[PDB]
Amino acid sequence: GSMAETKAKAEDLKMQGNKAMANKDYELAINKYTEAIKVLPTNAIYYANRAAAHSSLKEYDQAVKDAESAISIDPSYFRGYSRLGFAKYAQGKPEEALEAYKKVLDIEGDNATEAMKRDYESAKKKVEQSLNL
Amino acid sequence: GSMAETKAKAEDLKMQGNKAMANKDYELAINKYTEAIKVLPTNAIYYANRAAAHSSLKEYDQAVKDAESAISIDPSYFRGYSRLGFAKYAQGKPEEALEAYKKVLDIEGDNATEAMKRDYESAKKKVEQSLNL
């Protein structure tokens, strides 16, 4: 049992989770990402990926937990904030969704994709709506 | 004439370049990016986009020059190195392509996409093919 062998085992489980996501087997994906975390619990990507699978099943509270874990483990991994913002937005918490999406743009700057800006703008519009009435 | 109006003018030219790229009118795209740079010459994105238009015409020496300008103006804008890596790869300079593509992975770290790693692995396979002749 080496650090390299442990990492390779967890990475293989992550890959099985990614394949499940592509097949829209979100229930299987949650299993594989969970199993990967149990092998290697210090890798933020596995938590962000599980957040995506949870969100795909509309389990936004579970998604938020995993996104916050990703953010805690690696605050520079911006997909953590993307997952948090998507789940907060879906829960009707646009102010926290806006803060998460803005963090993505703060990290990426001029590197930000069009999708990242759109997510930020959608949350921003929703926060504006909540004030007009 | 406000700074935002100048930026909006350059961005509209950039968008005209993006439309030209979508239509595969690469000569027109080069013009629009050039005009954007003349309106606002401090934005590395215009140079990186012009490098893409040059590369599409297989003008790789011109692409390298624009990619290097993008990198000088904005060293953390990783698409400048992606443009440099492509141009060098296409020139048959795969060690220099590998260094460019590796710099993208160093900037992005655990945020790197599968496309970025595919580019890196492609340059690496060409470097290794070369030293195995």
Binding site: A29, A48, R79, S82, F86, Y89, A115 | -
Partner: peptide, 7 residues
Amino acid sequence: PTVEEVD
């Protein structure tokens, strides 16, 4: 809402 692919 952008549904982002896993990594």
